[PDB]
Design a binder for this molecule. Structure first.
Ligand SMILES: [Zn+2]
Lengths: 97, 107, 100, 45, 284, 47, 202, 97, 70, 504, 115
């Protein structure tokens, strides 16, 4: 903490919810490539270590435009070709079925 | 002091529309401009123009990432003071599909 | 400007219903040892950030000891806001609280 | 001269390169390094 | 539901996963050997079955046994998305001592994430040492070794009443005890004092009240990170903390020539302390 | 049983009001017991 | 449907108060007055003098720059009023000190005087330079505006000072003086400079 | 005793820096860098299982740069024929020798 | 190159510096030329008892424009 | 044969309308070569390129024509052109940054960053700087953040700190609005140099370097002419050579160049017509805020000692502005004791002072002290130490220091004393405060040996009885800081000889 | 207190993988000041005061083409007591790749010692 850096806005309450399929507006990456490295160890684009998910291995980030020191990282989505359910809510969809 | 101010105190950015930690982004501007912090899912992309009898954007609602994608809207952010594990908590609940919404009521 | 005119006016009216007037306030006339610890914490944190001091700091170099002298002369310009558990509150100034 | 000591028969010895770790006299595979004239300082405490 | 939105049944179903960012998915390493992240081992497995069912869908595009492989894919694309979220809810091979515990077991244990990393944390500006007895300090004090004393610091803001103390603290520097170790300017940038001579340190010490000519930071002032002095405060605790008197506030008394924390006998009843190899933590 | 109660709150659309001390340390808000059960306000002299 | 879903999109980009022309001339009225509400910090050093603090911290960096939330360039402020955190005008108000820092946040009202040009507005200004690429003007002796070539009519010629510059002469054989009248096409929030993109077409 | 990595600023020099508390990094003249994360882990042969065999190795204060192929190998695949002596190829000089 | 570091300082928009929120609280209402002249007389004289003296000069080119001639 | 090359850029100009940006990436690359690389552009092909852009900039403004503007902006060494190629390049910037004033954001990054060059080298850098400050009035606000951004580092060479400041003094002339900012940027960055020089300097005994032939060192540098992926981990021998003799001439070169400039700017006509008062206001309101809260610092307060001593008007707004500091009620203690310290040594060490201003000071002082002994003698014998009266003890030293260096002023033909000094000092020395014991030992014994020779008051018996009868440490160290002690700067002292009184 | 450390250079190498790294120094690729603690064979002089950070033996590896020295990392300063260099029996006629080094840590009675 610094006492010379005040914060004006504070959190008062936390709502719980479910992310719906508007992840598409959120994440515009669509991680498809199952290969995570290559030869020469570089991140292959479309893989899990893609450079639009944050800076990595002394690369600038694709979306953040910042190095590892200042990027937050960003979330990527995997398209599932079918609606696989959620094992959190499974015992409760099994009751409404 | 022993659990926030001297362990993992991070001043993070939060959108005051969707109430989220991880959807914010600082844009990749012109080199003759200033970057600002913008939400992603509150921002609608610039290939969603729909139509004083007409609309036109005030040139400051439009921001870009380094991928080149323009986005309209997605502003209304501010900075809060959270522990850093609450970022790691939020991301490891998104991987379960769970959305935490934060209400930043002193604004 | 249509929403904010009403959303403010709801907020300042809700905040007036929870303010307890000075003749109706019912809590203790004493400073309750946590009010005393936070007043000296908050005042010393203001003194160290160049707030104007209202006491002769007679060669004292400690911000926490400066506020302990302003508290003895009733010179701290702070206000305790005591929240009752439904959110309503009483405003007690530091000058009118008895100090243990 | 950098030297070693055979650990079985106490015969002094030195090895350079393409030289097996063995005693020339017996054939002992364990060699212990000898100490040469080199300054170390101590407080007498 | 003031937003009056509809409870939809696709809240139970996942048409997309989301992947945590790169910072939250760094590769693990032990010894000096980099491994691949555990979160990525059971996530590309979802991303191969996303591709196995994708080529197998093209066989349906030209039109038995291909459905026996298609229904086999729907079990494992469920049994892998079950493994990214839990680890006992996806049984799979059932061979015992299952690795990659999934994003639930990261949240649930004695360790978990809540207990080990939210409810309790590890802290900066703390110390610990074996304690020793002392009848010659006060009963409310603690005897701090000079090893601890020139390491723990306090961010003192510089003002018109402490500039006499804080000049000498910058002049003494990181080795003489009533000293300092960093100054922080009004733009938040830190200036370390470790390599400097007394001339660079007397240069900095005579500039603590000089206003930087900015307009964004005319409110702020500098901060000297002074060492821990005799007027400072310390929370001491014997570690099994049964009651709140086992974590009390002591006054600092910096004692030369000593290598352990040093405590009065009147404090040994409250900490359940005997001086036989016990340690106490010192939070500043 | 962390995710067990978490499922019970997501199905319930629950607004955590952040007033128990375990909920305040998670979000980093100041605790409401002792020195956090009141506010301090500075009385400023000019209109 | 999508006829009331898009109200959270389309209503957000519609500027409310258009600019009317004045004295039956044609030049629009762009200097407007807007009342706002600020949520600002207050220093511990301005705690004996709270209004001078709000002026020197938050209001003075805001003048003569473009602000997003008013759509114009802030020319000044009149009637700054700290909202009291004690409902009960009075001299001794009180603001709320944050728990971690010694800084106090409060609400304030003030009336801005922002300058608000829109499309189709008609502005005046003295011509600063002119070339065979554009004309450049200063609106109210302070605001940059460039009328580029693809918005100037075809039938005008650029006379050439043959050694060192030169007039942009219209179809009438008139070298144009300073005071020009042109219509706004676009307004720029490019950098830290506000520039009006204008036309001369009908 | 300085170790490499990224470049340096603090208005002087692109070089290697001086870390102060093994994860906090300073410059050579007393100006501070930001957030070294200092990858460490605890040991509970145990702690799961030795899963696979993959050749990735730390040599550059953190992520992998060692155990990378075909970059230091060209002058190593020819040292056998050149450095050792008396190769027995001597046919006509042996008529002279 | 040197515009690309100290980029939190190149943001330069802390909570001490810029307000937290600004909301328009009514509809903006147009003033006349007779009133901006009476405003800018008051606003410039009040700030002539720092910063802002690089922006008063921009106002004094605005003030002179409404009642005179370059 | 220069026309076919002028058709290649005009054929390239509509290729963004073909939407490729292909041949532009070889044209625009070709002009941004370094200025030692002979495949750059020349003055023929530049004027070929320039006026294709000065007439048809309507489509370079696109999102892909942007890059060639960068190469025109970062066309390095650009002031080295002949005037039929230079004044056409100056004509291009005056229209590019007026067509699209998104580029005045970016071009002024180059204009301020070349103020390192001398005055005669940047006649064009200041012409473009004067001009857009009239054209874009909203550029005082962010070119200001370019002045402090491109100020050079202190441990660099010496030509940058003497010539970046000299081109910056050109700025204050043709840039009246940006004035209080110029002096705040300089005075704050002299102290970075002034402060590291006294702690490199010896004691109060004068230091001589025994150098009869001084070092001109005009030739002290080279000629003005101006990796492999990783490096490998390295070792010691940073070898920071300290500012022993370098930072003595850094403060010679700069602080002489400052007071040369203000010798012009205050004059008996700018005190009426220009802003000769305005330079005196922008330094006095920079005196009591910047240099007056510094410790242990010679060599900077000679500037106000040199400005005020020009004209007699400037003493009547600095001998009373110093009393605005040194006798107030709203101010803290150590501001007042350091300013009463400034009081006695300004009046004693300034030759151009008139005697109409000496007893203008020395009567207000004796009026304060005699009013003090009236109200507060009965607070001596009570509870409390003698540290309650640090103000009185500082003022009594501030009075006796005047008498040590200006005693022949207080006489007349008769030998009388103004303000009754033999009646004053015989009364105040023997008071219950006893101001001989709690003041500076060297200057109160200096006073004893003089006021016996002047036969004003006798105090050796009390000095003898005080040291037979006999925190505090930093209070004595204000009483030992004489601000206008003589100088270390070997070149700035020469102009002070006309102004500064020596020890005898 | 005495402590032995086994410095081993066959710990990573497969049985089929030939010999990569060698005790000693590699020429023309040189950090100095390692020669205050270490000897020509890349082994420490015995009797030498070491601290944490100090080099405890040097080696030259063929792959990275570098001169690499192992570092002693313990908070207790020690002296090199004995250096045994271990020959091989199974794979005969091969060069030196196993060295055990014994330290001694002197332990005067400190405050806190239990008698
Ligand atoms: Zn540096």
């Amino acid at each position: 903490m610094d006492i010379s850096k005040p914060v004006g806005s504070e959190i008062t309450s936390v709502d719980f919810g479910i992310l719906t399929a508007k992840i598409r507006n959120l994440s515009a990456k669509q991680i498809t490539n199952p290969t995570v490295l290559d030869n020469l160890g570089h991140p292959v684009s479309g893989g899990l270590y893609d450079l639009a998910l944050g800076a990595f291995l002394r690369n600038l980030c694709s979306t953040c435009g910042l190095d590892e020191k200042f990027c937050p990282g960003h979330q990527g989505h995997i398209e599932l070709p079918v609606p696989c359910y959620n094992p959190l809510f499974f015992n409760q969809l099994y009751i409404y079925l | 002091d022993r659990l926030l101010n001297s362990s993992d105190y991070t001043q993070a950015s939060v959108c005051r529309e969707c109430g989220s930690i991880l959807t914010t982004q600082q844009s990749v501007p012109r080199i003759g401009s200033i970057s600002t912090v913008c939400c992603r899912r509150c921002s609608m992309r610039f290939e969603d123009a729909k139509k004083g009898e007409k609309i036109f954007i005030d040139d400051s609602q439009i921001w870009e990432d380094g991928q080149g994608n323009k986005f309209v809207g997605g502003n209304e952010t501010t900075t809060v003071a959270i522990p850093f594990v609450l970022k790691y908590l939020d991301s490891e609940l998104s991987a379960m599909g769970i959305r935490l919404r934060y209400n930043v009521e002193p604004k | 400007p249509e929403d904010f005119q009403q959303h403010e006016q709801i907020r300042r009216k809700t905040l007036k219903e929870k303010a307890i007037p000075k003749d109706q306030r019912a809590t203790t006339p004493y400073m309750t040892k946590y009010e005393r610890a936070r007043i000296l914490g908050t005042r010393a944190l203001q003194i160290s950030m160049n707030a104007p001091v209202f006491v002769d700091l007679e060669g004292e170099t400690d911000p926490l000891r400066i506020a302990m002298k302003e508290l003895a002369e009733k010179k701290i310009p702070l206000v305790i806001r005591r929240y009752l558990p439904d959110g309503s509150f009483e405003d007690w100034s530091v000058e009118e609280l008895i100090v243990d | 001269t950098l030297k070693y000591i055979c650990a079985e028969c106490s015969s002094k010895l030195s090895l350079s390169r393409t030289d097996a770790v063995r005693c020339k006299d017996c054939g002992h595979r364990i060699l212990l390094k000898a100490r040469t004239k080199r300054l170390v300082q101590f407080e007498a405490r | 539901n003031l937003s009056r939105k509809l409870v939809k049944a696709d809240s139970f179903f996942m048409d997309v996963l989301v992947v945590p960012p790169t910072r939250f998915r760094l590769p693990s390493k032990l010894g000096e050997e980099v491994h691949e992240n555990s979160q990525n081992q059971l996530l590309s497995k979802v991303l191969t079955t996303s591709l196995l069912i994708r080529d197998l869908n093209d066989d349906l595009s030209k039109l038995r046994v291909i459905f026996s492989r298609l229904m086999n894919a729907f079990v494992t694309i469920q049994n892998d998305v079950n493994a990214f979220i839990d680890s006992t809810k996806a049984q799979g091979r059932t061979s015992g001592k299952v690795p990659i515990p999934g994003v639930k077991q990261a949240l649930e244990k004695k360790e978990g994430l809540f207990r080990k990393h939210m409810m309790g944390k590890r802290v900066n500006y703390a110390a610990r040492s074996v304690i020793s007895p002392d009848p010659n300090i006060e009963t409310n004090e603690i005897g701090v070794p000079p090893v601890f004393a020139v390491k723990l610091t306090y961010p003192e803001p510089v003002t018109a009443y402490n500039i006499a103390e804080l000049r000498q603290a910058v002049i003494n520097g990181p080795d003489k005890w009533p000293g300092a170790t960093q100054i922080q300017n009004e733009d938040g940038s830190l200036v370390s004092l470790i390599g400097m001579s007394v001339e660079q340190r007397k240069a900095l010490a005579n500039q603590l009240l000089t206003p930087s000519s900015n307009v964004s930071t005319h409110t702020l002032n500098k901060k000297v990170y002074r060492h821990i002095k005799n007027r400072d405060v310390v929370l001491m605790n014997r570690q099994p903390t049964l009651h709140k008197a086992s974590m009390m506030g002591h006054k600092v008394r910096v004692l030369p020539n000593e290598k352990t924390l040093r405590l009065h006998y009147a404090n040994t009843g409250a900490y359940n302390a005997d001086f036989d190899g016990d340690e106490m933590n010192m939070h500043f | 049983t962390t995710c067990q109660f978490l499922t019970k709150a997501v199905l319930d659309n629950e607004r955590e009001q952040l007033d128990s001390p375990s909920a305040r340390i998670v979000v980093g808000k100041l605790n409401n017991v002792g020195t956090g059960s009141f506010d301090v306000l500075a009385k400023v002299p000019n209109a | 449907n999508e006829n009331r879903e898009t109200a959270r999109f389309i209503k957000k980009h519609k500027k409310q108060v258009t600019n009317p022309i004045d004295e039956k001339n044609g030049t629009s009225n762009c200097i407007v007055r807007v009342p706002i509400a600020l949520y600002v910090s207050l220093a511990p050093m301005y705690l004996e003098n709270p209004l001078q603090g709000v002026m020197k911290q938050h209001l003075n960096p805001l003048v003569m720059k473009y602000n997003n939330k008013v759509g114009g360039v802030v020319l000044g402020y009149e009637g700054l009023k700290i909202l009291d955190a004690d409902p009960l005008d009075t001299s001794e108000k009180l603001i709320k000190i944050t728990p971690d820092t010694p800084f106090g946040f409060t609400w304030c009202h003030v009336n801005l005087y922002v300058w608000q040009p829109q499309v189709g507005d008609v502005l005046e200004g003295y011509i600063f330079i002119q070339s065979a690429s554009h004309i450049g003007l200063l609106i109210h002796d302070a605001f940059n505006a460039s009328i580029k070539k693809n918005n100037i009519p075809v039938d005008w010629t650029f006379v050439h000072n043959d050694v060192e510059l030169g007039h942009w002469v219209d179809s009438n054989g008139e070298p144009i003086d300073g005071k020009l009248r042109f219509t706004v096409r676009n307004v720029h929030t490019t950098g830290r400079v506000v520039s009006v993109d204008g036309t001369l077409i009908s | 005793t300085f170790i490499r990595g990224p470049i340096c600023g603090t208005d002087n020099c692109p070089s290697r820096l001086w870390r102060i508390i093994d994860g906090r990094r300073t410059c050579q003249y007393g100006h501070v860098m930001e957030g070294d994360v200092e990858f460490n882990d605890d040991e509970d042969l145990g702690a799961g299982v030795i899963t696979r065999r993959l050749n990735l190795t730390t040599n550059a204060t953190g992520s992998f740069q060692s155990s990378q192929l075909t970059n230091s190998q060209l002058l190593q695949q020819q040292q056998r024929q050149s450095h050792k002596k008396f190769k027995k190829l001597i046919g006509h000089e042996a008529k002279l020798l | 190159m040197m515009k690309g570091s100290r980029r939190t300082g190149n943001n330069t928009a802390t909570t001490l510096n810029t307000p937290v929120v600004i909301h328009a609280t009514q509809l903006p209402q147009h003033v006349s030329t007779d009133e901006v002249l009476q405003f800018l007389e008051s606003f410039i004289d009040e700030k002539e008892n720092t910063n802002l003296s690089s922006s008063i000069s921009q106002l004094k080119r605005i003030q002179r424009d409404f009642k005179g001639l370059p | 044969s220069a026309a076919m090359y002028s058709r290649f850029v005009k054929s390239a100009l509509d290729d963004l309308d073909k939407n490729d940006s292909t041949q532009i990436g070889i044209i625009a690359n070709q002009v941004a070569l370094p200025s030692k690389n002979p495949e750059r552009i020349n003055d023929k092909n530049l004027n070929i390129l320039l006026d294709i852009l000065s007439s048809n900039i309507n489509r370079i403004e696109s999102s892909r024509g942007t890059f060639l503007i960068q190469s025109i902006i970062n066309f390095e060494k650009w002031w080295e052109l002949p005037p039929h190629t230079l004044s056409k390049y100056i004509y291009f910037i005056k229209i590019l940054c007026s067509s699209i004033p998104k580029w005045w954001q970016d071009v002024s990054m180059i204009l301020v960053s070349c103020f390192i060059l001398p005055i005669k080298q940047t006649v064009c850098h200041h012409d473009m700087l004067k001009y857009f400050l009239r054209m874009i009035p909203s550029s005082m606000g962010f070119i200001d953040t370019y002045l402090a951004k491109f100020f050079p580092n202190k441990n660099d060479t010496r030509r940058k700190l003497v010539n970046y400041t000299s081109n910056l003094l050109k700025l204050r002339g043709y840039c009246s609005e940006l004035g209080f900012q110029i002096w705040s940027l300089l005075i704050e960055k002299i102290i970075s140099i002034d402060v590291e020089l006294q702690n490199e300097l010896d004691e109060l005994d004068d230091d001589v370097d025994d150098d009869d032939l001084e070092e001109v060192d005009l030739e002290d540098d080279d000629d003005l002419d101006d990796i492999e992926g990783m490096d490998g981990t390295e070792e010691y021998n940073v070898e920071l050579t300290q500012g022993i003799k370098e930072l003595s001439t850094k403060l010679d070169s700069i602080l002489t160049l400052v007071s040369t400039h203000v010798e012009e700017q205050v004059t008996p006509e700018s005190l009426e017509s220009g802003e000769g008062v305005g330079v005196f206001n922008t330094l006095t309101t920079l005196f009591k805020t910047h240099v007056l809260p510094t410790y242990y610092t010679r060599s900077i307060q000679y500037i106000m000692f040199h400005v005020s001593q020009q004209q007699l008007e400037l003493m009547d707004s600095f001998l009373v502005t110093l009393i605005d500091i040194s006798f107030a009620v709203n101010e803290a203690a150590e501001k007042k004791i350091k300013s009463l310290q400034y009081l006695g040594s300004y009046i004693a060490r300034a030759k151009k002072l008139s005697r109409t201003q000496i007893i203008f000071v020395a009567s207000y002082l004796t009026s304060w002290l005699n009013r003090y002994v009236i109200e507060r003698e009965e607070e001596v014998d009570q509870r409390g130490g003698m540290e309650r009266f640090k103000h009185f003890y500082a003022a009594f030293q501030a009075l006796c220091y005047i008498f040590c260096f200006r005693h022949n002023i207080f006489r007349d033909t008769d030998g009388n004393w103004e303000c009754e000094l033999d009646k004053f000092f015989q009364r105040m020395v023997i008071s219950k405060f006893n101001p001989l014991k709690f003041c500076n030992e060297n200057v109160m014994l200096m006073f004893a040996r003089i006021a016996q020779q002047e036969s004003v008051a006798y105090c050796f018996s009390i000095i003898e009885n005080n040291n037979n009868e006999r925190t505090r440490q930093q209070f004595i160290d204000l009483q030992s800081y004489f601000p206008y002690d003589p100088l270390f700067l070997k070149n700035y002292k020469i102009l002070m000889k006309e102004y500064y009184i020596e020890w005898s | 207190m005495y402590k032995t450390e086994k410095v081993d250079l066959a710990l990573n190498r497969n049985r089929g993988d030939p010999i990569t790294q060698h005790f000693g120094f590699g020429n023309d690729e040189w950090p100095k000041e390692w020669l205050e603690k270490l000897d020509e064979d890349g082994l420490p002089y015995i009797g030498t005061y070491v601290e944490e950070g100090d080099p405890i033996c040097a080696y030259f590896d063929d792959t990275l083409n570098k001169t690499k020295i192992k570092t002693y990392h313990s908070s207790e300063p020690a002296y090199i007591e004995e250096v045994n260099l271990i020959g091989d029996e199974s794979n005969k006629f091969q060069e030196l790749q196993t060295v055990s080094i014994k330290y001694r840590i002197r332990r005067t009675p400190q405050i806190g010692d239990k008698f």
